[PDB]
């Protein structure tokens, strides 16, 4: 069934932070990708079982993180990339507030 933008509005109104995440992830397209701590893309060749992670053209075999995002977000990121846009994802803050 649909948990549309409007269905999201109400949840935000309710302050039901956890139920919204649950609905948007665990209940539909939650997914696990590997980020590069340097270049911030899903470039990581993740051979998990051999415990091998590498971002060639970064020589990054250390700075690797796993993140949980919707598959549509992953798709969107790969879609933005196909149009030469880099949606770099970083797990640490720079600017502050």
């Amino acid at each position: 069934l649909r948990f549309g933008e409007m269905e999201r509005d109400c949840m935000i109104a309710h302050g039901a932070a956890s139920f919204l995440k649950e609905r948007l992830m665990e209940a539909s397209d939650a997914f696990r990708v590997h980020i590069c701590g340097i270049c911030g893309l899903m470039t990581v060749i993740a051979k998990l079982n051999h415990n091998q992670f590498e971002c060639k053209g970064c020589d990054n075999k250390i700075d690797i993180y796993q993140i949980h995002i919707p598959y549509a977000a992953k798709l969107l990121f790969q879609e933005l990339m196909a149009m030469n846009i880099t949606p770099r994802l970083y797990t640490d803050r720079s600017r502050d507030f």
């Binding site: 302050g15 932070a17 919204l20 948007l24 995002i69 919707p70 880099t86």
Partner: protein, 112 residues
């Protein structure tokens, strides 16, 4: 004094149908349309051309066009808008998400 006239009109559109909306609701919308020293429209042109998140703004009206400039101007989305977390499948800093929860080993050992 422009704010005053704005609320007055917004109120008289709602009160024409007889219906009642508590001050604060129309007041907020009016306050929002105004804090940026002048009349900020509730359009694709107005609020959507703010300094707010890149992903946040793209979530309405210009989308691809917003994200194209996002790359060409090297924008850095703060990830504090509701939208951003909704897109990133993360718990938004909304109500139940506006604070953090910690276990104090001290109080824990105190109970047992």
């Amino acid at each position: 004094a422009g704010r005053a006239a704005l609320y007055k009109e917004v109120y008289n559109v709602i009160a024409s149908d007889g219906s009642y909306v508590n001050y604060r609701h129309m007041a907020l919308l009016v306050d929002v349309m105004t804090t940026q020293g002048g009349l900020t429209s509730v359009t694709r042109h107005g609020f959507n051309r703010s300094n707010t998140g890149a992903l946040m703004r793209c979530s309405f009206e210009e989308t691809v066009e917003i994200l194209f400039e996002a790359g060409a101007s090297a924008e850095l989305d703060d990830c504090r808008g509701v939208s951003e977390n909704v897109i990133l499948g993360q718990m938004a800093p909304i109500g139940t998400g506006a604070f953090d929860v910690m276990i104090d080993e001290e109080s824990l050992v105190k109970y047992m």
